[PDB]
Amino acid sequence: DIAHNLAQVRDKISAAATRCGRSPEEITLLAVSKTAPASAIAEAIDAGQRQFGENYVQEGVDKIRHFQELGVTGLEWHFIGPLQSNKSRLVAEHFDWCHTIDRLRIATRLNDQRPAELPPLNVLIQINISDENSASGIQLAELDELAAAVAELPRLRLRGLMAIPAPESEYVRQFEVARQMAVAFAGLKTRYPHIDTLSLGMSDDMEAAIAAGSTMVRIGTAIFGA
Numbered sequence: 001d002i003a004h005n006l007a008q009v010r011d012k013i014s015a016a017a018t019r020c021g022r023s024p025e026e027i028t029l030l031a032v033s034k035t036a037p038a039s040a041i042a043e044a045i046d047a048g049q050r051q052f053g054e055n056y057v058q059e060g061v062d063k064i065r066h067f068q069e070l071g072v073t074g075l076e077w078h079f080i081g082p083l084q085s086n087k088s089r090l091v092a093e094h095f096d097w098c099h100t101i102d103r104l105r106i107a108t109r110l111n112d113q114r115p116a117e118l119p120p121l122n123v124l125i126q127i128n129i130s131d132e133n134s135a136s137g138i139q140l141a142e143l144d145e146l147a148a149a150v151a152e153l154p155r156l157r158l159r160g161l162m163a164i165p166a167p168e169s170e171y172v173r174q175f176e177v178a179r180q181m182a183v184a185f186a187g188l189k190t191r192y193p194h195i196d197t198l199s200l201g202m203s204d205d206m207e208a209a210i211a212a213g214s215t216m217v218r219i220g221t222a223i224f225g226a
């Protein structure tokens, strides 16, 4: 049951934050609903969840339109999958956040495709921190350059960083990789305005990411099931 899973996940988040001396309010739960049907999202919505993460543009847009047709207010939709140039218009027209900025041309497209009547699209820059098998995300060495370029796009708002670390079994490495992101995040916060979002941690590494300094865990299966 989705309402039960939501409350439980939220308890683990709340425990994990206070144990490491953090207010639980600091951590946002992003309910990842890729491969969940709109009916499962509706259950989470009714239980109070407002923030949802989608990986595949067209399915995400279908879910967004479904709930617009119902009139549901206060939802916040995060695109967290890799963004292809031929589908960037759909993200710019329908989503509130995009976590996967890893090249300037895609961010310029998003900027130029964002309808004028909408507020700026909130974006995160994606770091490939530890995954030699992913083509998504930049190296940390490229961050200062890309962040400066993206920060000038007036139809976007740079909010921080996202990473999908390579999967790790040892809690030690989970923490250590998450800390590299946390360190990059704090360094970025010392010069850029409104840097407040570090999208870091999934179901299996949630405690390490929070201890490392994540502000936003992306939880799918522990909420919606397989």
Ligand SMILES: *Cc1c(COP(=O)(O)O)cnc(C)c1O
Binding pocket: 032, 034, 055, 080, 081, 164, 202, 203, 204, 218, 219, 220, 221, 222
């Ligand atoms: C699917 C996915 C998640 C959620 O994964 P779970 O293991 O089900 O918690 C989080 N972030 C991204 C980028 C994903 O693609």
